[PDB]
Symmetry: C2
Subunit: 595 residues, 2 copies
């Protein structure tokens, strides 16, 4: 898919290059594809995309800055200071000084300005300024510039939110996931309406049924208290604890709570999952259609490069001239659609990639035997039934890397999803030879490759193959969940920071103190992230909700936890379930086509 062919080649080379780009799934921007003299514009797009590692590193740096900033409650002079990390149950990451924060922010903003305005080199000015994505990015960069300036000048801070928005906007798969999700929201709010109606009605029955009982006197003291407890019971997290007083008062009370939990989980929760799954399928189909339209647009541009006369036809003397530039550089008359069908058929049957310029099958057996020997060595070493053996295996693994990159070349080697990981962990190993036991886990991280041999076992092939394909293909969804946690974390540290401290005295009544959860707090960004992970797992989750309700003295604090549950569990994790199921069924159909 050579940039040089697109930039400089004769039209037949440009056509073959656009074809290989399209069927490798890479679209040139329409702002380039729609113009005649596109080569000089494309020149800049390729130098832009050559720098993707620099831009990606800048975005991950900008996002990770949130983990190293001092909490705002520490700036407003607490007694004692946040140097007393044990008094405030804080984490172990350093807090950047003002000087360090200024340096970090200035550097990352300068690279962000370059990345955001450089597209005006290949898009034109009017084309640039009319893109909605560019306008939103310019708004984000100007907000970060003003936020930098207004503290280089030296009740809340905006920057951490804008950094997460910039990160979302800078990864195509995350933008795509949010566009997909925006199509699901309309149908999601309907079933939330029915779920609320269910909770309200079940809570009304429960309230009027227990009003003068011990359950009434001690748990269901009001309709709001009932609705709160019944909401937590929908999650099952407070079962059976919430209805023990009823069961002590009468064993028949268990029938009500049995019916409630049975209906709430096995009917209502599964139907919410089903609604989310159907909507996800509809939006994914719409996305794949859009990608097919991109592919067709590129193939039509290729035909518009070969046809310079606009008669809409190419002859066999042109067609063989394209067929060479395809079948030996990347792998009757024809018309605009016939070309697209013929080429996608070539992409089906004949298409196997040629190797770039500049290995035996049993070599895989040799390295598999070596890494199983290494595994049995590691086990007999841990049970204490050798640094020179760990050295000689590390040497063999770097020798394998060097041999494979020599025989195939890195531009061919690095294409495989496996060997790029083997390369990464081998590099981390050899740079670990800085002269502990941590190399044990790196070599076993290589040993994990042995699990691919279970794809030879037909009863396991589908499972292992789906797990392997899921590792990369879930990253957009897991990353969207991660960005949602980052926003909720910044809110939590803004609204709850400093309340969990060793002098609070109310804290030691709060259940957070009784369950020993005091390190899972919102005093710091990493603390908030691990707390939000515990919330996402739903294990004991209402402990934090009830404790921060006590510590803040307001029921409005529960809006945080309720909204977090409604967004992340009932929607995003159900989306993950749907995605895993659809991936597995796709694998079974692929095997049913292989056989």
């Amino acid at each position: 898919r050579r940039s040089e062919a697109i930039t400089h080649g004769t039209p037949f080379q440009k056509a073959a290059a656009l074809v290989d780009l399209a069927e490798d799934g890479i679209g040139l921007p329409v702002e380039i594809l729609d113009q005649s003299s596109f080569g000089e514009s494309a020149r800049y797009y390729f130098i832009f995309t050559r720098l993707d590692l620099i831009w990606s590193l800048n975005y991950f740096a900008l996002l990770f800055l949130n983990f190293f900033e001092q909490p705002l409650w520490c700036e407003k002079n607490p007694k004692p200071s946040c140097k007393d990390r044990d008094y405030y149950y804080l984490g172990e990451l350093p807090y950047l000084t003002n000087a360090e924060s200024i340096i970090y922010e200035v550097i990352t903003l300068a690279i962000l300005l370059v990345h955001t305005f450089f597209p005006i080199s290949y898009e034109g000015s009017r084309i640039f300024w009319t893109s909605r994505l560019n306008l939103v990015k310019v708004a984000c960069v100007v907000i970060l510039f003003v936020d930098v300036l207004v503290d280089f000048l030296y009740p809340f801070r905006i920057a951490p939110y804008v950094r997460v928005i910039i990160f979302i906007l800078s990864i195509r798969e995350l933008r795509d996931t949010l566009v997909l999700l925006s199509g699901m929201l309309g149908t999601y709010l309907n079933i939330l309406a029915l779920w609320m109606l269910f909770l309200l009605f079940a809570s009304w029955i429960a309230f009027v049924m227990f009003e003068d009982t011990q359950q009434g006197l001690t748990v269901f003291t009001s309709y709001g208290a009932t609705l709160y407890q019944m909401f937590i019971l929908f999650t099952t997290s407070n079962n059976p604890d919430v209805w023990i007083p009823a069961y002590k008062s009468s064993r028949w009370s268990s029938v009500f709570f049995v019916l409630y939990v049975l209906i709430g989980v096995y009917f209502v929760t599964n139907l919410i999952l089903a609604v989310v799954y159907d909507s996800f399928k509809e939006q994914l189909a719409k996305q794949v259609s859009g990608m097919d339209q991109m592919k067709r647009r590129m193939l039509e541009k290729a035909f518009g490069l070969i046809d310079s006369d606009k008669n809409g036809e190419i002859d066999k003397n042109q067609c063989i001239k394209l067929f060479e530039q395809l079948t030996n550089y990347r792998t009757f008359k024809i018309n605009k659609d016939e070309f697209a069908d013929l080429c996608q058929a070539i992409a089906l049957r004949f298409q196997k990639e040629e190797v770039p310029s500049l290995r035996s099958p049993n070599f895989g057996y040799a390295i598999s035997f070596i890494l199983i020997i290494n595994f049995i060595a590691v086990v007999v070493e841990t049970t204490l039934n050798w640094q020179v053996a760990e050295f000689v295996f590390g040497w063999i693994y770097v020798l394998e890397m060097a041999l494979k990159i020599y025989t195939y070349g890195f531009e061919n080697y690095w294409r495989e999803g496996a060997n790029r990981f083997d390369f990464l962990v081998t590099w981390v190993i050899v740079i670990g030879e800085t002269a502990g036991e941590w190399i044990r886990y790196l070599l076993l991280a290589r040993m994990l490759r042995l699990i691919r041999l279970l794809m030879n076992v037909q009863r396991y092939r589908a499972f292992i193959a789906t797990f392997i394909t899921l590792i990369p293909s879930l990253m957009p969804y897991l990353g969207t969940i991660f960005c949602v946690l980052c926003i909720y974390c910044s809110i939590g540290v803004q609204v709850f920071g400093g309340l969990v401290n060793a002098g609070n005295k109310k804290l030691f009544e709060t259940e957070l103190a009784e369950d020993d959860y005091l390190l899972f707090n919102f005093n710091d960004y990493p603390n908030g992230m691990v707390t939000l992970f515990n919330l996402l797992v739903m294990g004991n989750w209402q402990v934090w909700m009830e404790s921060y309700k006590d510590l803040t003295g307001t029921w409005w604090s529960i809006t945080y936890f309720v909204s977090f549950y409604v967004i992340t569990i009932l929607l995003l994790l159900n989306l993950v379930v749907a995605f895993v199921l659809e991936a597995f069924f796709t694998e079974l159909d692929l095997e049913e086509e292989e056989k």
Copy 2:
């Protein structure tokens, strides 16, 4: 579907009857259908099926006997006796005396012997004694007869297990569910192999990683302790509790447990659900195919009754003679397959059932207004903003019942799934007029019918329609889970009965005593059932496992809880999820066909 027509009719009436049976989904047994005589054999089958209510009541009585038997540990003379129900934290159901047990068992066994041997009236002797189902039923009844005799004579008791097996064998949909499940088991044990391999490897890494830490010294003290804790963490039920000492030692420890829980839940649990779902689909397809073969066999014997000359043929005079006996009672040559296609097409496009022997839409509006008025009356009554009003509404509801059974006749009325429930709750209401405040809940149980009006709201139609169809169609699966719970309950009372008592002294160290769960014990069958419900809900489920491990002093006790988790949660509840999802998608496709 007239039994008179099958038993006595002219062959054209027999043919029309067999057709209406087959297309209403009722199969005569093959032992009749192939008998070459629908006479005296069919006569007895219809009186047999006329008695279905008596048999069903006998089977439910036989199953429920388990809830009223004295636990065997009470018979072996405890001090104090089980009359001290508080000392043993017992339930509220009575225990039958020996005389009552003998009477109950003798009566139920007599009706069971009748039901099990009466088929030899229409099946022949050799046909009866070669049926595998009959032989298993005869083995069960002879075991119950021995177990009765061996205590009418006056280490464990077998009867409670055989009663559950008899109940499974006596309901067709439960036999169907078990034969379906037997097809899934092979593929289920494969993914259990990978799940165990995942637990063992993750637990080995965790063990060697923490060995000299506080996590090692206090939680991961051995490989077996690690594997046990990591298995509970796979359930999430001990998150974050299990790894707080690691997090106190180093915050980076959280990354291990985050990755473990992320992989274990969102990859492994979802792929187990996917495997179960695919296997369920394959087995349900095999079931529907068998039902279609039954339908075809019935249509082919209908043809074999019309073509009693074995022409291979029916002529137009015969065909219109059948056509009258069909279209005037129950809703050009032709051949064996053409008949079946034509009739099934008539069922699809033309059939609409006639009323049996012996109403305007505004009546539905009137009763909807009356029940909404009743609802606003109930709400304003409970908030205390009338027994004569509750009486007059109860009268209106019984007058509606009597009017509808008059206008349509009970044989037509009772066919709807809705009005048979309305009839039941109205009868329970009017027999409740024994003169109480509890009738509020029965009238609101009628008020629940108002939710059907949300099917008129297109954004809610599929959800409500699927919920309504799920109410009956999940009963075989929920009932299979109930039978599994019954067997586990009987085992639990056998092995754990009497250990939770106020004199145990070890109990008050056991977490069961600290969480206040002492009423959730295995001292009694209803206590066991509610305990196993709490286990099925997975809320705090490891409390019982760890407490009974401590009370029994052996790790072998955990086999009970582990096997219960593996059977019920990873298989049967995933089956319920698959069933609900497939039902929803079927509803969306139905609406997509109707719109």
